[PDB]
Structure 1
């Protein structure tokens, strides 16, 4: 036909086009047709279109949104392409499991972000006599010292997802991997209303006190800029924030440092993006689909897509010297975490959009209220999470 690949995705950026193009050019070269329809409003009509027999060949669906679409029977089993390309050998076990439904590949993963980073301006630290933290006590001690030296201690933007990034970090730090998993994967009631979650909010509140009150609306890349430009000391963010650093022409260690969010050493909170493959009717369109799935997990796209963006590739067998120094620390930390309970889904991997919304809402509401009681915030957390489920 020669068969058509229609991919619904949100990879809008110029850096992400380089990779998408490498995909297109190879599909064409393999004798198939390319077509895309790239929407925007990042964060996530496809349903109505797939529940009515006009799906795209592929769509961007991260988190649990895969199990739901699988369970509807709308996705296609990729046993053949998996088998031909030794997918089980290439993927970390926990990653492969996220991509399966009834033991069958239904989606191909394309990246691994780490959520639990702190980004550090080593020039700002030296001029402030500040010490790169490894504990929460030390994170505050650095914050004080930066303020005392007349820097913005924490660069932080006014969007709910960013408030909860910082929250989920604190949950991980205080509760450790197991408790984090109890809270965001199992939505365990005792955990979400317990003393340590309460401590996570108390610590959130306390981080609040060092944040700019005129942050409302502000994007993560503006907060990163305050760090890049030598005006702030730190930002707590996932490793997408490297893009901002790259685009400014920085390096690894010479301009910034990446450390694990204090107290989360040992753990890797992953954030994994993916293309779920729909059940199609045309044989040629299947062959195209299977090609897109193969190539999305080949070295060429796995390198370009994750490069100039900050995430790790999901393939285990990569030439990592192709990446920056922070991605190499991220690759090392991944493996350590992977030996045990340390590897956990970020909150964004770990629940439904409705539950996220509930948490985002509780967190921002409590962080935007200087009188808010942590003892109260855990009841709000739990009650909202119950209601969204």
Structure 2
């Protein structure tokens, strides 16, 4: 009788779990039976592999955390229809509650039916800094990479780890994409990671992106290989390191440890020309056996798109609402800056999808790029060799 749903996600511990708790509590308040299927692994690559295996085994969960064109790629597998939550989306008028771009991402049947619910917009192009460390070292928050490298050299010379970073493929790629946006610009990022333009992927602007990647390598510590993103954030909160380049799920950790922007830590975008790299956490609802699981799915979709839910969920998560009509008044200064910058970058053509977090590219392309980025980062590869390999690896993945 009760609505039921197995939910596959990678929100394991910390600020991620705290925010997810908001959803779990609302689902149980409507007598929903939550069947937890967590797959631990920053950024979701591991969940994506376990998710693919579940669907190949004809064991699809009722709901899965998923990104962008992976939604449409599963739809093309034929495993999502019928679109029982589009009935929810039409009655509630989702096309009037979401940007046209986010609405596109959520839709199946060649854009005809909603099949996924969005809960948020994360931003990738952020730098987090320990305020006491920067004040202690007479360092202004940098606004260019030249200013960042100079601040990093000064901190390094004072015995301080400048950049807390975990070297895992997706995590290298997260920094890489923020760097690319600033070194090359909005049109460059679009051409490379949205168009997959070969001349751009292997060109001299991409060489300069790998140039800066090589500099950032020198600013990380010996414990970086395989370190979890949230450990890196932890070292910034404890003042073991000065900076972290990471999306604003890092803010979920700062909040969960009772630190405030301005007073305890500084948040500033990575350099860009009115750029913004967006990331929408969303849940797809698969074809499933059982009327209780269909009602579970429609109940999750509705809850996930609620006005008050997206206010409370996102205060904990670190992101901003996907819903357009949610009051930002209660959010902190970093989230209000995110929402402001999103509006500005949208009007300037700088509002671009993160590829490291699944909005720009299907998983085959995302993986090809990550693999080249992490090999450059963890070796002594030249920048030009990396750009050649990047363009070849994208081309071969097509």
The alignment's TM-score, normalised by the length of structure 1, stands at 0.90
SS of 1:239's partner is coil
How far did residue 49 of structure 1 move? Answer: 5.8
How far did residue 246 of structure 1 move? Answer: 1.9
Provide the rounded CA distance (Å) in 2 between the counterparts of 1:19 and 1:230. 30
> What is the match of residue 7 of structure 2?
7
> What is the match of residue 40 of structure 1?
39
1:91 to 89, 92, 98: 98
> What is the match of residue 118 of structure 2?
109
Provide the rounded CA distance (Å) in 1 between the counterparts of 2:328 and 2:257. 22
Structure 2 residue 155 is matched with structure 1 residue 146: yes
How far did residue 297 of structure 1 move? Answer: 0.3
Shifted more, 360-369 versus 4-13: the winner is: 4-13
> What is the match of residue 79 of structure 2?
74
Runs of 5+ unmatched residues, structure 1: none
Structure 2 residue 278 is matched with structure 1 residue 270: yes
> What is the match of residue 363 of structure 1?
373
> What is the match of residue 177 of structure 1?
186
Runs of 5+ unmatched residues, structure 2: none
Contact 2:127 2:270 in 1 (8 A): yes
Provide the rounded CA distance (Å) in 2 between the counterparts of 1:254 and 1:214. 28
1:289 to 297, 318, 323: 297
SS of 2:268's partner is strand
Taking the TM superposition and a 5 Å limit, the aligned residue runs for 1:247-262 are 247-262=256-271
How far did residue 2 of structure 1 move? Answer: 5.3
1:323 to 315, 325, 331: 331
How far did residue 15 of structure 1 move? Answer: 0.7
Provide the rounded CA distance (Å) in 1 between the counterparts of 2:374 and 2:354. 18
Shifted more, 314-323 versus 109-118: the winner is: 314-323
Contact 2:185 2:273 in 1 (8 A): no
Taking the TM superposition and a 5 Å limit, the aligned residue runs for 1:227-266 are 227-262=236-271, 264-266=272-274
SS of 1:307's partner is helix
2:309 to 264, 289, 301: 301
How far did residue 337 of structure 1 move? Answer: 1.4
> What is the match of residue 218 of structure 1?
227
1:336 to 335, 339, 344: 344
Contact 1:115 1:270 in 2 (8 A): yes
Provide the rounded CA distance (Å) in 2 between the counterparts of 1:119 and 1:295. 31
Shifted more, 232-241 versus 319-328: the winner is: 319-328
How far did residue 3 of structure 1 move? Answer: 4.9
Provide the rounded CA distance (Å) in 2 between the counterparts of 1:255 and 1:134. 19
Contact 1:11 1:38 in 2 (8 A): no
Does the C-alpha gap of structure 1 residues 286 and 309 become closer, same or farther in structure 2, counting only changes over 3 Å? Answer: closer
SS of 2:37's partner is coil
Does the C-alpha gap of structure 1 residues 35 and 206 become closer, same or farther in structure 2, counting only changes over 3 Å? Answer: closer
Contact 2:277 2:351 in 1 (8 A): yes
Deviations 1:323-350 (A, max 9, x none): 2221111111111112232111101221
Deviations 1:31-58 (A, max 9, x none): xx42414132332265566578664332
